[PDB]
């Protein structure tokens, strides 16, 4: 009689996540088909409900932090023997992920599913890891890119439960399938299909969770062996739903198999390899579409979520080099301490083409949260900048400027990265093509610098902001808040 918990994402009633509710009941009946005793719980969410600019955005990535803590001590305090997660199209569903790998007891991911012809109809956070789980075998192939009013949706779910079941009884844990190889394998999509740059952060820290070894440099290595096989939304011209009818992910799957990316020996939640799982997709994707690419007719050569590294950023940082004309610039500094104030200097006029700013103290721990912003990117196109100034952050940022947008840049300054010894004026290098984000003073000086600076107060002495302040790690660990604490 096994014990398999539903952890119900998107349980925040709002417009949005009507149909989230219909396959936690055929998660639930398959579960009991099968032979197993369901318990439904619920998991907290804040996407689309979250407004940008401000700081409920700095909570975004706390509540990913919640909802592993949440399904861990529900999953823990119920001695389950399994547990199924449902994550809708939210921002923070990589949090059941997170817990999943906590726990270790077998598990699989069933996807809320896309929406038909915004933000889940391309491949932004929630698109590319649900696509992500299904390539490291978490989730059943095809899941990841099926409609969430569908009925093969529901269908899939119920499927998910049965192959669960299967799966306590064969003991098929996470610490089987997370492997290194799957890591591998997911970057290789992420790359293929032109995934967000959120998804580095939530696969190292899904791996830095489980233990297995993965850095940004993993990243930057795939990328240079992995072409963009998909022309998706927002940087491309397609939706999920065409990438679907393409053949979806088991398509994109089985052309970087045959062309020597993927490993076919990693395991799946069904017991099968990833080999066998795509045993009867064709190598090439169909004629007469243009979605995904074959592989000599890539819509870029190689990948587009470049790691760039240096003084400025020794641990390393991310920037999607996607549509960026010319992918250098050399500019004086212009600096802030948080999103509101430079968000105040562009829209004062204070930002001159050929500007790098720099947007620090909205890390992890300086945020704290790592929030996104938009309002920059956005501000900088409206003042008819975007194609002149460089941006960088050891926060993030939402969409692009035409020109060089770097986040996550590591060591933060609240822990005393170089980003933190930004004087005004410094002339800053971001160089694509070296891969480099240079900070262009002497070495000398910067010891100088550093010797000087003082750590600063937090933001938030008390609170939830507070308590993830405290146990939060670098971003180049994927912002994980269980590592290094004793």
Same mark, same amino acid.
């Given at each position: 009689?096994?014990? /398999? ?13 009507? &149909? ?24 907290? @969410? ?20 919640? $909802? ?59 698109? @590319?890891?649900?696509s992500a789980?299904?390539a ?47 890591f591998e394998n997911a970057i290789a999509v992420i790359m293929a299909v032109g995934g967000?740059?959120?998804a580095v ?17 993993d990243f930057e290595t795939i990328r240079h062996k992995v072409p963009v096989l998909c ?18 992910i088991?398509?994109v799957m089985k052309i970087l198999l045959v062309n020597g990316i993927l490993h ?28 995904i690419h074959s592989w000599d007719?890539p819509v870029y050569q190689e990948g587009h979520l470049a790691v ?13 080099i996607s &549509?960026?004309?010319?992918?250098? $610039? ?91 010894? /930004? ?54 660990? &994927? ?8």
């Amino acid at each position: 009689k096994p014990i /398999v918990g539903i952890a119900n994402g998107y349980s925040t009633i709002t417009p949005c996540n009507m &149909g989230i509710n219909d396959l936690a009941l055929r998660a639930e009946a398959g579960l009991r088909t099968a032979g197993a005793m369901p318990q439904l719980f619920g998991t907290i @969410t804040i996407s689309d409900g979250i407004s940008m600019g401000t700081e409920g955005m700095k909570y975004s990535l706390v509540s990913r932090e919640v $909802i592993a803590d949440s399904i861990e001590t529900v999953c823990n305090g119920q001695r389950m023997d399994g547990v199924l997660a449902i994550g809708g199209c939210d921002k923070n569903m990589p949090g059941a992920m997170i817990a999943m790998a906590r726990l270790n007891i077998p598990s699989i991911f069933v996807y809320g599913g896309t929406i038909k012809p915004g933000s889940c109809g391309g491949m932004f956070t929630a698109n @590319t890891m649900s696509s992500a789980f299904e390539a490291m075998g978490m989730s059943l192939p095809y899941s990841s890119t099926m409609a969430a009013v569908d009925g093969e949706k529901a269908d899939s779910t119920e499927e998910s439960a049965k192959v669960l079941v299967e799966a306590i009884k064969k003991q098929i844990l996470p610490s089987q399938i997370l492997t290194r190889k799957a890591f591998e394998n997911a970057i290789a999509v992420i790359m293929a299909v032109g995934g967000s740059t959120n998804a580095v952060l939530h696969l190292l820290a899904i791996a830095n969770t489980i233990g297995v070894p993965l850095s940004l440099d993993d990243f930057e290595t795939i990328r240079h062996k992995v072409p963009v096989l998909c022309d998706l939304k927002p940087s491309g011209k397609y939706v999920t739903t065409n990438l679907h009818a393409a053949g979806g992910i088991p398509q994109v799957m089985k052309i970087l198999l045959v062309n020597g990316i993927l490993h076919g020996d990693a395991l799946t939640i069904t017991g099968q390899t990833i080999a066998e799982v795509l045993a009867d997709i064709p190598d090439q994707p169909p004629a007469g579409q243009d979605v995904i690419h074959s592989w000599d007719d890539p819509v870029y050569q190689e990948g587009h979520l470049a790691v760039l590294k240096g003084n400025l950023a020794t641990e390393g940082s991310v920037a999607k080099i996607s &549509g960026v004309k010319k992918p250098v $610039i050399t500019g004086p500094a212009k600096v802030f301490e948080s999103e509101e104030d430079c968000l105040e200097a562009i829209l004062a006029g204070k930002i001159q083409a050929g500007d790098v700013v720099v947007v620090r103290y909205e890390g992890p721990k300086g945020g704290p949260g790592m929030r996104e912003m938009l309002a920059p990117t956005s501000a900088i196109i409206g003042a008819g900048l975007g194609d002149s100034v460089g941006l960088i952050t050891d926060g993030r940022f939402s969409g692009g400027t035409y020109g060089l947008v770097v986040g996550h840049v590591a060591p933060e300054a609240y822990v005393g990265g170089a980003i933190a010894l /930004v004087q005004e004026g410094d002339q800053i290098t971001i160089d694509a093509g070296k891969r480099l984000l240079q900070l262009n003073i002497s070495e000398e000086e910067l010891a100088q610098r550093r010797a000087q600076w003082t750590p600063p107060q937090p933001r938030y002495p008390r609170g939830i902001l507070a308590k993830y302040a405290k146990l939060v790690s670098s971003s180049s660990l &994927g912002a994980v808040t269980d590592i290094d604490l004793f």
